[PDB]
Amino acid sequence: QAVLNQPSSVSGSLGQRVSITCSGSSSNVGNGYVSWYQLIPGSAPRTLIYGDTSRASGVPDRFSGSRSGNTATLTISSLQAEDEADYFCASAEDSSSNAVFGSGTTLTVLGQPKAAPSVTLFPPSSEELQANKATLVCLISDFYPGAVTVAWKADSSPVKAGVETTTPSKQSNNKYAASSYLSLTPEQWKSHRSYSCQVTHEGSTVEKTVAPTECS
Amino acid sequence: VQLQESGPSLVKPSQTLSLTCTTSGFSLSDKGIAWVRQAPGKALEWLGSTDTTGSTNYNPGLKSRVIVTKDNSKSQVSLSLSSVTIADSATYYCTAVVQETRKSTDRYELHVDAWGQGLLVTVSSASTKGPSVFPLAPSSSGGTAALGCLVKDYFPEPVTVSWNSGALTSGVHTFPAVLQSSGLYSLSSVVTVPSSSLGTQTYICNVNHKPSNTKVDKKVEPKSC
Protein backbone atom coordinates (compact mmCIF):
# COMPACT_ATOMS: atom_id res chain seq x y z
CA GLN A 1 0.00 0.00 0.00
CA ALA A 2 1.24 3.46 -0.92
CA VAL A 3 1.42 5.91 1.98
CA LEU A 4 1.58 9.71 2.03
CA ASN A 5 4.45 11.32 3.93
CA GLN A 6 3.65 12.98 7.26
CA PRO A 7 5.82 13.90 10.24
CA SER A 8 5.48 11.38 13.04
CA SER A 9 4.78 14.05 15.66
CA VAL A 10 4.19 17.77 16.10
CA SER A 11 3.85 19.98 19.17
CA GLY A 12 2.31 23.35 19.94
CA SER A 13 1.44 25.24 23.09
CA LEU A 14 -2.01 26.12 24.38
CA GLY A 15 -3.52 28.99 22.43
CA GLN A 16 -0.89 28.79 19.69
CA ARG A 17 -0.87 27.50 16.11
CA VAL A 18 0.54 24.28 14.65
CA SER A 19 0.95 23.02 11.09
CA ILE A 20 0.89 19.39 9.93
CA THR A 21 2.18 18.55 6.47
CA CYS A 22 1.15 15.87 3.97
CA SER A 23 3.60 15.23 1.14
CA GLY A 24 3.16 13.08 -1.95
CA SER A 25 3.69 13.02 -5.70
CA SER A 26 2.10 14.91 -8.56
CA SER A 27 -0.28 11.94 -8.94
CA ASN A 28 -1.82 12.08 -5.45
CA VAL A 29 -1.31 15.25 -3.40
CA GLY A 30 -0.47 17.17 -6.58
CA ASN A 31 -3.92 16.35 -7.95
CA GLY A 32 -5.47 18.31 -5.09
CA TYR A 33 -8.58 17.36 -3.17
CA VAL A 34 -6.59 16.34 -0.12
CA SER A 35 -8.68 15.48 2.93
CA TRP A 36 -7.81 15.47 6.63
CA TYR A 37 -9.05 13.22 9.44
CA GLN A 38 -8.73 13.40 13.22
CA LEU A 39 -8.39 10.12 15.12
CA ILE A 40 -9.03 10.38 18.86
CA PRO A 41 -8.66 7.08 20.77
CA GLY A 42 -12.00 5.43 21.44
CA SER A 43 -13.91 7.56 18.91
CA ALA A 44 -14.75 7.10 15.26
CA PRO A 45 -12.38 9.01 12.95
CA ARG A 46 -13.63 12.54 12.27
CA THR A 47 -13.43 14.22 8.88
CA LEU A 48 -12.03 17.75 9.23
CA ILE A 49 -11.11 18.95 5.73
CA TYR A 50 -11.81 17.88 2.15
CA GLY A 51 -11.04 19.41 -1.22
CA ASP A 52 -7.76 20.82 0.16
CA THR A 53 -9.50 23.71 1.92
CA SER A 54 -13.17 22.90 2.62
CA ARG A 55 -14.18 22.33 6.23
CA ALA A 56 -16.47 19.41 6.97
CA SER A 57 -19.81 20.06 8.62
CA GLY A 58 -19.42 20.91 12.29
CA VAL A 59 -15.71 21.77 12.03
CA PRO A 60 -14.79 25.25 13.38
CA ASP A 61 -12.76 27.74 11.37
CA ARG A 62 -9.56 27.32 13.41
CA PHE A 63 -9.08 24.09 11.43
CA SER A 64 -7.87 25.13 7.97
CA GLY A 65 -6.32 23.33 5.03
CA SER A 66 -4.02 24.53 2.27
CA ARG A 67 -1.81 23.12 -0.44
CA SER A 68 1.41 24.23 -2.13
CA GLY A 69 2.22 21.83 -4.96
CA ASN A 70 2.88 18.32 -3.65
CA THR A 71 2.61 19.20 0.06
CA ALA A 72 -0.71 19.89 1.77
CA THR A 73 -0.96 21.44 5.23
CA LEU A 74 -3.48 21.22 8.05
CA THR A 75 -3.22 24.24 10.34
CA ILE A 76 -4.81 24.29 13.80
CA SER A 77 -4.94 27.61 15.65
CA SER A 78 -5.95 28.40 19.24
CA LEU A 79 -4.77 24.95 20.32
CA GLN A 80 -6.67 23.40 23.22
CA ALA A 81 -6.25 20.18 25.18
CA GLU A 82 -8.87 18.32 23.11
CA ASP A 83 -6.74 18.77 19.97
CA GLU A 84 -4.38 16.01 21.11
CA ALA A 85 -5.03 13.33 18.50
CA ASP A 86 -3.56 11.59 15.46
CA TYR A 87 -4.14 13.48 12.19
CA PHE A 88 -4.22 11.65 8.85
CA CYS A 89 -4.31 13.09 5.35
CA ALA A 90 -5.63 11.32 2.28
CA SER A 91 -6.09 11.77 -1.44
CA ALA A 92 -7.23 9.82 -4.46
CA GLU A 93 -4.57 8.22 -6.63
CA ASP A 94 -5.09 7.61 -10.37
CA SER A 95 -8.84 7.10 -9.84
CA SER A 96 -11.67 8.42 -7.70
CA SER A 97 -12.09 4.88 -6.30
CA ASN A 98 -8.58 4.45 -4.84
CA ALA A 99 -7.39 6.38 -1.78
CA VAL A 100 -3.92 6.66 -0.27
CA PHE A 101 -3.60 7.72 3.36
CA GLY A 102 -0.78 9.39 5.22
CA SER A 103 1.14 7.77 8.06
CA GLY A 104 -0.48 10.02 10.65
CA THR A 105 0.90 12.84 12.80
CA THR A 106 0.43 12.72 16.57
CA LEU A 107 -0.16 16.18 18.06
CA THR A 108 0.95 17.02 21.60
CA VAL A 109 -0.43 20.20 23.16
CA LEU A 110 2.16 21.76 25.46
CA GLY A 111 1.61 24.09 28.38
CA GLN A 112 -0.95 21.85 30.06
CA PRO A 113 -0.87 21.31 33.84
CA LYS A 114 0.84 18.21 35.14
CA ALA A 115 -1.71 15.81 36.65
CA ALA A 116 -0.64 13.13 39.11
CA PRO A 117 -2.04 9.58 38.79
CA SER A 118 -4.89 8.34 40.93
CA VAL A 119 -4.36 4.74 42.02
CA THR A 120 -6.90 2.08 42.98
CA LEU A 121 -5.57 -1.30 44.13
CA PHE A 122 -7.69 -4.43 44.57
CA PRO A 123 -6.61 -7.63 46.32
CA PRO A 124 -7.50 -11.06 44.94
CA SER A 125 -11.18 -11.86 45.27
CA SER A 126 -12.31 -14.76 47.44
CA GLU A 127 -13.75 -16.32 44.28
CA GLU A 128 -10.41 -16.23 42.48
CA LEU A 129 -8.54 -17.59 45.51
CA GLN A 130 -11.01 -20.48 45.62
CA ALA A 131 -9.99 -21.14 42.00
CA ASN A 132 -6.38 -21.44 43.24
CA LYS A 133 -5.37 -18.18 41.53
CA ALA A 134 -4.59 -14.68 42.75
CA THR A 135 -4.42 -11.38 40.86
CA LEU A 136 -3.63 -7.97 42.31
CA VAL A 137 -5.19 -5.26 40.13
CA CYS A 138 -3.62 -1.79 40.07
CA LEU A 139 -5.70 0.78 38.18
CA ILE A 140 -4.09 4.09 37.30
CA SER A 141 -6.04 7.07 36.00
CA ASP A 142 -6.16 10.82 35.43
CA PHE A 143 -2.44 11.39 34.77
CA TYR A 144 -0.76 13.74 32.30
CA PRO A 145 1.77 13.60 30.62
CA GLY A 146 0.98 10.06 29.51
CA ALA A 147 3.90 8.10 30.94
CA VAL A 148 4.24 6.17 34.20
CA THR A 149 6.41 3.41 35.58
CA VAL A 150 4.99 0.82 37.97
CA ALA A 151 6.83 -1.09 40.69
CA TRP A 152 5.33 -3.80 42.90
CA LYS A 153 6.53 -4.54 46.44
CA ALA A 154 5.97 -7.65 48.56
CA ASP A 155 6.07 -6.13 52.03
CA SER A 156 9.03 -3.86 51.23
CA SER A 157 10.89 -6.13 48.78
CA PRO A 158 10.72 -5.70 44.98
CA VAL A 159 8.62 -8.11 42.94
CA LYS A 160 9.57 -8.57 39.29
CA ALA A 161 7.94 -11.87 38.33
CA GLY A 162 4.26 -12.03 37.42
CA VAL A 163 3.86 -8.35 36.50
CA GLU A 164 2.04 -7.20 33.36
CA THR A 165 1.45 -3.49 32.75
CA THR A 166 -0.44 -1.85 29.92
CA THR A 167 0.66 1.01 27.75
CA PRO A 168 -0.93 4.32 28.82
CA SER A 169 -4.06 5.29 26.91
CA LYS A 170 -6.12 8.45 26.59
CA GLN A 171 -9.27 8.76 28.69
CA SER A 172 -12.19 11.00 27.69
CA ASN A 173 -10.99 13.90 29.89
CA ASN A 174 -7.64 14.51 28.09
CA LYS A 175 -5.76 12.52 30.75
CA TYR A 176 -4.31 9.01 30.60
CA ALA A 177 -5.03 5.64 32.16
CA ALA A 178 -3.07 2.45 32.65
CA SER A 179 -3.35 -0.79 34.60
CA SER A 180 -0.89 -3.23 36.14
CA TYR A 181 -1.61 -6.83 37.15
CA LEU A 182 0.46 -8.91 39.58
CA SER A 183 -0.15 -12.66 39.35
CA LEU A 184 0.64 -14.63 42.51
CA THR A 185 -0.10 -18.00 43.98
CA PRO A 186 -2.60 -17.95 46.85
CA GLU A 187 0.30 -19.15 49.01
CA GLN A 188 2.53 -16.22 48.02
CA TRP A 189 -0.32 -13.76 48.56
CA LYS A 190 -1.04 -14.99 52.09
CA SER A 191 2.65 -15.39 53.02
CA HIS A 192 3.31 -11.62 53.11
CA ARG A 193 1.92 -8.92 55.36
CA SER A 194 1.13 -6.60 52.44
CA TYR A 195 1.66 -5.83 48.78
CA SER A 196 2.04 -2.36 47.28
CA CYS A 197 1.58 -0.92 43.80
CA GLN A 198 3.90 2.07 43.38
CA VAL A 199 3.28 4.36 40.39
CA THR A 200 5.98 6.88 39.46
CA HIS A 201 4.91 9.87 37.36
CA GLU A 202 7.27 12.70 36.42
CA GLY A 203 9.57 11.81 39.32
CA SER A 204 6.78 11.55 41.93
CA THR A 205 5.70 8.14 43.26
CA VAL A 206 2.16 7.41 44.47
CA GLU A 207 1.18 4.08 46.00
CA LYS A 208 -1.58 1.93 47.44
CA THR A 209 -1.24 -1.10 49.68
CA VAL A 210 -3.40 -4.18 50.26
CA ALA A 211 -3.13 -6.97 52.82
CA PRO A 212 -4.42 -10.57 52.76
CA THR A 213 -6.28 -10.02 56.05
CA GLU A 214 -8.72 -7.61 54.38
CA CYS A 215 -12.09 -9.04 53.35
CA SER A 216 -12.63 -9.66 49.64
CA VAL B 1 -26.16 8.72 9.41
CA GLN B 2 -25.58 5.15 10.60
CA LEU B 3 -22.87 2.72 9.44
CA GLN B 4 -23.04 -0.45 11.53
CA GLU B 5 -20.29 -3.02 10.99
CA SER B 6 -20.87 -6.66 11.82
CA GLY B 7 -18.96 -9.88 11.36
CA PRO B 8 -16.60 -12.20 13.21
CA SER B 9 -14.00 -10.88 15.61
CA LEU B 10 -11.77 -13.92 14.91
CA VAL B 11 -10.74 -15.57 11.65
CA LYS B 12 -8.11 -18.21 11.00
CA PRO B 13 -5.19 -17.79 8.59
CA SER B 14 -6.04 -18.75 4.98
CA GLN B 15 -9.78 -18.25 5.59
CA THR B 16 -11.97 -15.53 4.08
CA LEU B 17 -12.95 -12.54 6.23
CA SER B 18 -16.57 -11.53 5.60
CA LEU B 19 -17.90 -8.32 7.13
CA THR B 20 -21.19 -6.50 6.68
CA CYS B 21 -22.10 -2.83 6.93
CA THR B 22 -25.76 -2.07 7.58
CA THR B 23 -26.60 1.51 6.65
CA SER B 24 -29.47 3.73 7.74
CA GLY B 25 -30.53 7.34 7.36
CA PHE B 26 -29.82 7.74 3.64
CA SER B 27 -30.47 6.14 0.25
CA LEU B 28 -27.88 3.37 -0.06
CA SER B 29 -28.43 3.20 -3.83
CA ASP B 30 -27.33 6.86 -4.07
CA LYS B 31 -24.16 6.90 -1.94
CA GLY B 32 -20.72 5.34 -2.07
CA ILE B 33 -19.67 3.04 0.77
CA ALA B 34 -16.08 2.00 1.31
CA TRP B 35 -14.05 -0.17 3.67
CA VAL B 36 -10.99 1.28 5.39
CA ARG B 37 -8.86 -0.54 7.95
CA GLN B 38 -6.13 0.41 10.41
CA ALA B 39 -3.57 -1.74 12.17
CA PRO B 40 -2.42 -0.40 15.57
CA GLY B 41 -0.06 2.51 15.02
CA LYS B 42 -0.10 2.08 11.23
CA ALA B 43 -1.56 4.13 8.41
CA LEU B 44 -5.17 3.85 7.36
CA GLU B 45 -5.50 1.47 4.42
CA TRP B 46 -8.11 1.67 1.66
CA LEU B 47 -9.68 -1.70 0.90
CA GLY B 48 -12.37 -0.90 -1.68
CA SER B 49 -15.69 0.76 -2.29
CA THR B 50 -19.04 0.03 -3.92
CA ASP B 51 -17.99 2.00 -7.03
CA THR B 52 -14.67 1.11 -8.65
CA THR B 53 -13.29 3.31 -11.43
CA GLY B 54 -10.24 3.05 -13.62
CA SER B 55 -8.57 -0.32 -14.08
CA THR B 56 -5.47 -1.06 -12.00
CA ASN B 57 -4.36 -2.98 -8.92
CA TYR B 58 -3.02 -0.11 -6.79
CA ASN B 59 -2.15 -2.55 -3.97
CA PRO B 60 -0.16 -5.79 -4.40
CA GLY B 61 -1.18 -7.06 -0.97
CA LEU B 62 -4.89 -6.64 -1.76
CA LYS B 63 -4.46 -7.78 -5.38
CA SER B 64 -7.73 -9.60 -6.09
CA ARG B 65 -8.43 -10.41 -2.43
CA VAL B 66 -11.18 -7.80 -1.90
CA ILE B 67 -14.80 -7.93 -3.03
CA VAL B 68 -17.27 -5.21 -2.03
CA THR B 69 -20.95 -5.59 -2.91
CA LYS B 70 -24.23 -3.81 -2.23
CA ASP B 71 -27.45 -5.61 -1.27
CA ASN B 72 -30.11 -2.92 -1.67
CA SER B 73 -32.83 -5.21 -0.30
CA LYS B 74 -31.00 -5.31 3.06
CA SER B 75 -29.31 -1.87 3.03
CA GLN B 76 -26.08 -3.83 3.44
CA VAL B 77 -22.60 -3.43 1.98
CA SER B 78 -20.34 -6.47 2.17
CA LEU B 79 -16.59 -6.94 2.40
CA SER B 80 -14.86 -10.17 1.45
CA LEU B 81 -11.12 -10.45 2.11
CA SER B 82 -9.76 -13.82 1.00
CA SER B 83 -6.71 -15.81 2.12
CA VAL B 84 -6.14 -13.75 5.25
CA THR B 85 -2.83 -13.78 7.10
CA ILE B 86 -1.99 -12.41 10.53
CA ALA B 87 -1.10 -9.16 8.74
CA ASP B 88 -4.82 -8.65 8.06
CA SER B 89 -5.49 -8.16 11.79
CA ALA B 90 -6.88 -4.63 12.08
CA THR B 91 -9.88 -2.48 12.90
CA TYR B 92 -12.19 -2.44 9.87
CA TYR B 93 -14.27 0.69 9.24
CA CYS B 94 -17.37 1.07 7.13
CA THR B 95 -17.37 4.56 5.60
CA ALA B 96 -19.54 6.80 3.45
CA VAL B 97 -17.48 8.38 0.67
CA VAL B 98 -17.78 11.05 -1.98
CA GLN B 99 -16.24 9.95 -5.30
CA GLU B 100 -16.10 12.43 -8.19
CA THR B 101 -14.07 13.19 -11.30
CA ARG B 102 -13.94 16.99 -11.38
CA LYS B 103 -11.88 17.86 -14.48
CA SER B 104 -9.69 20.18 -19.15
CA THR B 105 -7.62 17.85 -16.94
CA ASP B 106 -9.28 15.09 -14.92
CA ARG B 107 -8.69 15.48 -11.18
CA TYR B 108 -9.92 12.75 -8.84
CA GLU B 109 -12.03 13.64 -5.79
CA LEU B 110 -12.29 11.09 -2.98
CA HIS B 111 -12.93 11.78 0.69
CA VAL B 112 -14.69 10.02 3.55
CA ASP B 113 -17.80 11.87 4.71
CA ALA B 114 -18.77 9.59 7.62
CA TRP B 115 -17.02 6.85 9.59
CA GLY B 116 -18.42 3.85 11.41
CA GLN B 117 -17.19 2.87 14.84
CA GLY B 118 -14.99 0.13 13.42
CA LEU B 119 -14.93 -3.61 14.05
CA LEU B 120 -11.86 -5.31 15.49
CA VAL B 121 -10.72 -8.41 13.59
CA THR B 122 -7.97 -10.70 14.89
CA VAL B 123 -6.50 -13.25 12.48
CA SER B 124 -5.28 -16.19 14.56
CA SER B 125 -5.47 -19.97 14.80
CA ALA B 126 -5.97 -19.80 18.58
CA SER B 127 -9.39 -20.89 19.78
CA THR B 128 -11.79 -18.44 21.38
CA LYS B 129 -11.85 -18.44 25.18
CA GLY B 130 -14.45 -16.79 27.37
CA PRO B 131 -13.42 -14.76 30.42
CA SER B 132 -13.63 -15.63 34.06
CA VAL B 133 -15.29 -12.73 35.87
CA PHE B 134 -14.46 -11.89 39.46
CA PRO B 135 -15.92 -9.15 41.69
CA LEU B 136 -13.58 -6.48 43.01
CA ALA B 137 -15.27 -5.62 46.29
CA PRO B 138 -15.30 -2.06 47.65
CA SER B 139 -13.02 -1.69 50.66
CA SER B 140 -13.00 0.76 53.59
CA SER B 141 -12.52 8.17 51.30
CA GLY B 142 -14.14 11.47 50.35
CA GLY B 143 -17.50 9.75 50.69
CA THR B 144 -16.93 7.53 47.64
CA ALA B 145 -16.09 3.86 47.16
CA ALA B 146 -14.49 2.05 44.22
CA LEU B 147 -15.84 -1.34 43.15
CA GLY B 148 -15.20 -3.27 40.01
CA CYS B 149 -15.05 -6.46 38.01
CA LEU B 150 -11.99 -8.35 36.80
CA VAL B 151 -12.48 -9.89 33.35
CA LYS B 152 -9.71 -12.47 33.22
CA ASP B 153 -8.07 -14.59 30.52
CA TYR B 154 -10.16 -14.18 27.38
CA PHE B 155 -9.40 -14.29 23.66
CA PRO B 156 -9.84 -12.48 21.32
CA GLU B 157 -10.65 -8.84 21.92
CA PRO B 158 -13.08 -7.20 22.41
CA VAL B 159 -15.02 -7.40 25.66
CA THR B 160 -17.81 -5.04 26.71
CA VAL B 161 -18.72 -4.20 30.29
CA SER B 162 -21.83 -2.37 31.47
CA TRP B 163 -23.13 -1.84 35.00
CA ASN B 164 -26.69 -2.48 36.15
CA SER B 165 -27.72 -3.28 32.58
CA GLY B 166 -26.70 0.18 31.37
CA ALA B 167 -28.56 2.15 34.04
CA LEU B 168 -25.24 3.14 35.68
CA THR B 169 -22.81 5.13 33.52
CA SER B 170 -21.58 7.96 35.73
CA GLY B 171 -18.29 7.13 37.42
CA VAL B 172 -17.70 4.02 35.28
CA HIS B 173 -14.17 3.49 34.01
CA THR B 174 -13.38 0.39 31.95
CA PHE B 175 -9.67 0.02 31.40
CA PRO B 176 -7.98 -1.26 28.23
CA ALA B 177 -6.91 -4.87 28.44
CA VAL B 178 -3.48 -6.23 29.26
CA LEU B 179 -2.09 -8.93 26.96
CA GLN B 180 -0.26 -11.68 28.81
CA SER B 181 2.47 -13.99 27.56
CA SER B 182 -0.17 -16.74 27.46
CA GLY B 183 -1.79 -14.80 24.61
CA LEU B 184 -4.89 -14.14 26.73
CA TYR B 185 -6.31 -10.74 27.68
CA SER B 186 -7.51 -9.37 31.00
CA LEU B 187 -9.23 -6.09 31.76
CA SER B 188 -11.00 -4.43 34.66
CA SER B 189 -13.99 -2.12 34.97
CA VAL B 190 -14.38 0.09 38.04
CA VAL B 191 -17.32 2.23 39.11
CA THR B 192 -16.99 4.99 41.70
CA VAL B 193 -20.08 5.42 43.86
CA PRO B 194 -21.14 7.16 47.08
CA SER B 195 -20.03 5.15 50.09
CA SER B 196 -23.48 5.74 51.61
CA SER B 197 -25.15 3.89 48.71
CA LEU B 198 -23.42 0.58 49.46
CA GLY B 199 -26.20 -0.47 51.85
CA THR B 200 -29.14 0.46 49.62
CA GLN B 201 -27.90 -0.03 46.03
CA THR B 202 -27.06 -3.24 44.18
CA TYR B 203 -24.17 -3.20 41.71
CA ILE B 204 -23.89 -5.77 38.92
CA CYS B 205 -21.34 -5.74 36.10
CA ASN B 206 -22.61 -7.17 32.81
CA VAL B 207 -19.74 -8.74 30.86
CA ASN B 208 -20.28 -9.76 27.23
CA HIS B 209 -17.63 -11.57 25.19
CA LYS B 210 -19.30 -12.07 21.82
CA PRO B 211 -16.63 -14.27 20.16
CA SER B 212 -17.23 -17.00 22.76
CA ASN B 213 -20.94 -16.31 23.41
CA THR B 214 -20.02 -15.64 27.04
CA LYS B 215 -22.37 -13.43 29.06
CA VAL B 216 -21.82 -13.06 32.81
CA ASP B 217 -23.69 -10.92 35.34
CA LYS B 218 -21.57 -10.60 38.48
CA LYS B 219 -22.84 -8.96 41.65
CA VAL B 220 -20.22 -6.80 43.38
CA GLU B 221 -20.79 -6.14 47.07
CA PRO B 222 -18.83 -5.28 50.21
CA LYS B 223 -17.33 -8.37 51.83
CA SER B 224 -17.29 -9.07 55.56
CA CYS B 225 -14.99 -11.38 57.52
A122 and A25 in one domain? no
Neighbours of A52 (CB within 10 A): 17
A195 and A165 in one domain? yes
Query: How determined?
Result: X-ray
Residue B140: burial class (beta carbons within 10 Å; 0-12, 13-18, 19+):
exposed
Domain boundary among A76, A110, A144: A110
A126 and A66 in one domain? no
The whole-angstrom distance between residue B158's C-alpha and the CA centroid of its chain comes to 7
**A30-47 burial code (b ≥16 CB/10 A, e <16):** bbbbbbbbbbeeeeebbb
| A142, A173 Cβ separation under 8 angstroms | yes
Q: Is the torsion defined by CA of B193, B195, B199, B200 positive or negative?
A: negative
Inside any domain, residue A216:
no
A166 and A104 in one domain? no
Q: Which residues of B touch A139 (CB under 8 A)?
A: 148, 173, 175, 188, 190
The answer to whether A188 contacts chain B (CB < 8 Å) is no
Domain boundary among A85, A110, A135: A110
Across the A:B interface, residue pairs with CB atoms under 8 Å apart total 170
A84 and A137 in one domain? no
- Number of residues written out for chain A: 216
CATH code for the domain in which residue A124 is found = 2.60.40.10
**What residues does B140 pair with on adjacent strands?**
none
A104 and A38 in one domain? yes
Rounded Cα distance between A24 and A70, Å, is 6
A95 and A11 in one domain? yes
Neighbours of B126 (CB within 10 A): 12
- Go through the domains of chain B in sequence order and give each one's CATH number: 2-123 (2.60.40.10), 132-219 (2.60.40.10)
Task: Please give, rounded to a whole number of angstroms, the shortest distance from the CA of B12 to a CA of chain A.
Answer: 23
User: Residue A51: CB partners within 8 Å, gap ≥ 6?
Assistant: A32, A33, A34, A35, B109, B111
| A8, A21 Cβ separation under 8 angstroms | no
Say if the Cβ atoms of B112 and A45 lie within 8 Å.
yes
Rounded Cα distance between B33 and B39, Å, is 20
Inside any domain, residue A49:
yes
Domain boundary among A50, A79, A110: A110
Q: Which residues of A touch B224 (CB under 8 A)?
A: 215
A102 and A15 in one domain? yes
Inside any domain, residue A215:
no
Rounded Cα distance between B196 and B213, Å, is 36
Task: Please give, rounded to a whole number of angstroms, the shortest distance from the CA of A77 to a CA of chain B.
Answer: 23
The answer to whether B225 contacts chain A (CB < 8 Å) is yes
> Closest residue of A to B180, CA-based?
A164
The whole-angstrom distance between residue B51's C-alpha and the CA centroid of its chain comes to 25
Rounded Cα distance between A145 and A142, Å, is 10
Rounded Cα distance between B161 and A95, Å, is 43
3-class SS letters over A107-134:
EEEECCCCECCEEEEECCCHHHHHCCCE
Rounded Cα distance between A179 and A24, Å, is 40
Task: Name the domain count of chain A.
Answer: 2
C-alpha distance from residue B4 to each of A5, A28, A73, A157, B76 (Å): 31, 30, 32, 51, 9
Say if the Cβ atoms of B224 and A215 lie within 8 Å.
yes
A105 and A42 in one domain? yes
A147 and A95 in one domain? no
Nearest to A15, CA basis, from A60, A77, A63, A62: A77
The answer to whether A155 contacts chain B (CB < 8 Å) is no
Task: Please give, rounded to a whole number of angstroms, the shortest distance from the CA of A30 to a CA of chain B.
Answer: 10
Inside any domain, residue A106:
yes
The answer to whether B169 contacts chain A (CB < 8 Å) is no
DSSP letters spanning A41-78: TTS--EEEEETTTEEPTT--TTEEEEEETTEEEEEE-S
Inside any domain, residue A74:
yes
The answer to whether A72 contacts chain B (CB < 8 Å) is no
Range of the domain at A195: 118-210
Task: Please give, rounded to a whole number of angstroms, the shortest distance from the CA of B128 to a CA of chain A.
Answer: 21
